[PDB]
Amino acid sequence: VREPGSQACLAIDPLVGEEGGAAVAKLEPHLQPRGQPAPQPLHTLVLA
Amino acid sequence: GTLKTSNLPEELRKVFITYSMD
């Protein structure tokens, strides 16, 4: 008989870098609000 | 609303009309 002492099997486990991983970022455009005095289209009429 | 007046010079105020009798 032989003993597995020296030849024992190996388990594996990755060295995950999640602890130092950057996050996913969401973008939102800062709308030029119409609540603030934004301009409007100058629909014109004629006084005949 | 607000009022407005055009700066259209007098030279651009000339118009010509072509038509038929009916």
Blueprint of the fold:
The structure is cut from a larger assembly and holds chains A (48 residues) and B (22 residues).
Chain A: no helix or strand
Chain B: no helix or strand
Structure description:
The structure is cut from a larger assembly and holds chains A (48 residues) and B (22 residues). By secondary structure, chain A is largely without helices or strands. Helix content of chain A is 0%, strand content 0%. Chain A has no helices and no strands. With 22 residues, chain B is low in regular secondary structure. Chain B has no helix or strand. Chain B is elongated and about 40 Å long. In chain B, 0% of the residues are buried. The A-B interface holds A 44-45, 47 and B 1, 3-4. Chain A: This is Interleukin-17 receptor A. Chain B: It comes from Homo sapiens.
Report the biggest beta sheet of chain B as strand number plus sense, adding barrel if it closes.
none
Distance between the termini of chain B: 41 Å
Helix run count of chain B: 0
Shape of chain A: rod-shaped
Number of strands of chain A: 0
Tell me the number of helical segments of chain A per DSSP (H or I, 4 or more residues long).
0
Helix content of chain A: under 10%
